[PDB]
Scaffold this active site. Sequence first.
Site, PDB file in Angstrom:
ATOM      1  N   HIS A   1       3.710 -35.267  -2.817  1.00  0.00           N
ATOM      2  CA  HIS A   1       3.152 -34.508  -3.919  1.00  0.00           C
ATOM      3  C   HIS A   1       1.626 -34.575  -3.877  1.00  0.00           C
ATOM      4  CE1 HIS A   1       2.744 -32.432  -7.606  1.00  0.00           C
ATOM      5  NE2 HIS A   1       1.978 -33.436  -8.039  1.00  0.00           N
TER       6      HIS A   1
ATOM      7  N   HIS B   1       3.387 -30.418  -1.371  1.00  0.00           N
ATOM      8  CA  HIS B   1       4.658 -29.730  -1.233  1.00  0.00           C
ATOM      9  C   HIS B   1       4.418 -28.212  -1.172  1.00  0.00           C
ATOM     10  CE1 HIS B   1       6.195 -33.393  -3.829  1.00  0.00           C
ATOM     11  NE2 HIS B   1       6.366 -33.667  -2.539  1.00  0.00           N
TER      12      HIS B   1
ATOM     13  N   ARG C   1       9.362 -31.042 -17.875  1.00  0.00           N
ATOM     14  CA  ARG C   1       9.195 -29.600 -17.815  1.00  0.00           C
ATOM     15  C   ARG C   1       9.231 -29.087 -19.258  1.00  0.00           C
ATOM     16  NH1 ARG C   1      11.169 -32.851 -13.958  1.00  0.00           N
ATOM     17  NH2 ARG C   1      12.167 -31.921 -12.089  1.00  0.00           N
TER      18      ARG C   1
HETATM   19 ZN   LIG Z   1       4.818 -31.546  -5.726  1.00  0.00          ZN
END
Ligand SMILES: [Zn+2]
Lengths: 153, 153
Positions: A71, A80, A143
């Site tokens: 990441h 990514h 999220r």
């Molecule tokens: Zn990521």
Amino acid sequence: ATKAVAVLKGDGPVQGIINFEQKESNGPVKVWGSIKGLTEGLHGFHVHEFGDNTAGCTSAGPHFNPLSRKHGGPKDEERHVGDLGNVTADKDGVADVSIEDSVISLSGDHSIIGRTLVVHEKADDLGKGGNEESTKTGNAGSRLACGVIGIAQ
Amino acid sequence: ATKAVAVLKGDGPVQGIINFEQKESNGPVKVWGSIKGLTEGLHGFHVHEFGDNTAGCTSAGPHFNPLSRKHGGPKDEERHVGDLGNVTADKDGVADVSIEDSVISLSGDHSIIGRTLVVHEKADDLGKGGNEESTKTGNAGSRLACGVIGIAQ
Ligand SMILES: [Zn+2]
Ligand SMILES: [Cu+]
Ligand SMILES: [Cu+]
Ligand SMILES: [Zn+2]
């Protein structure tokens, strides 16, 4: 295909409206956009593996990109397959995105269409957590809202 | 891919959680699931071309299908492509979807991943409404709620 948009939602006020346009297949995709309804500061902005939303902006997955490196984002090489990372919302929640990427492909092979754009509450670590999360979503938190692209033109 | 979804929403009570499965990339795409939150009777259900939702389920393309023939259904040959016909809601506002799009595919050539699903206020006339709108979206009226196809396998 040539122009793509994702509308994000979840909380309600948080409405995202991305514009991923490829001037040509040989052009980097300018991944611009304009979320509103968020709180201030950098926010979680990434690709995720599944486009799916059946659980409600969760089943979408962690960042299970194929080129699993680390990441990161436009700050890292290890990024990514669509870590925008940390983009700043104004006091009004207005986060302007205007970055361009020569990695993803609106159409072709990668066909970054049926993916889930997620707006997170917090800024990512962009890998620097040194945690299991750090190599996945950094430290973006949950999220909050999410959206699927679906091509525009 | 083999499994994809389309979470439809707009109003808030109205949401669909449609599951698109193709056992192969060349098998029937059996599109099953349900929209909960409707009011009784037949309702708008199609596969609009553009993902695009920037305006709010408005701009997604009034069925800009390649096989430009007529707005029809599994009643007509001349159906655009993904004119499901009509989905009928129980008293509870639960309309079952369980059709084989034994026409298109999630990936390969037809590659419908990305396309936008819309639940409408009213029933489809399926072309034989006798308005521009009958021939364009079936006179099904206001696009209450919509969703974008995203992969899950
Ligand atoms: Zn990521
Ligand atoms: Cu994310
Ligand atoms: Cu429709
Ligand atoms: Zn149609």
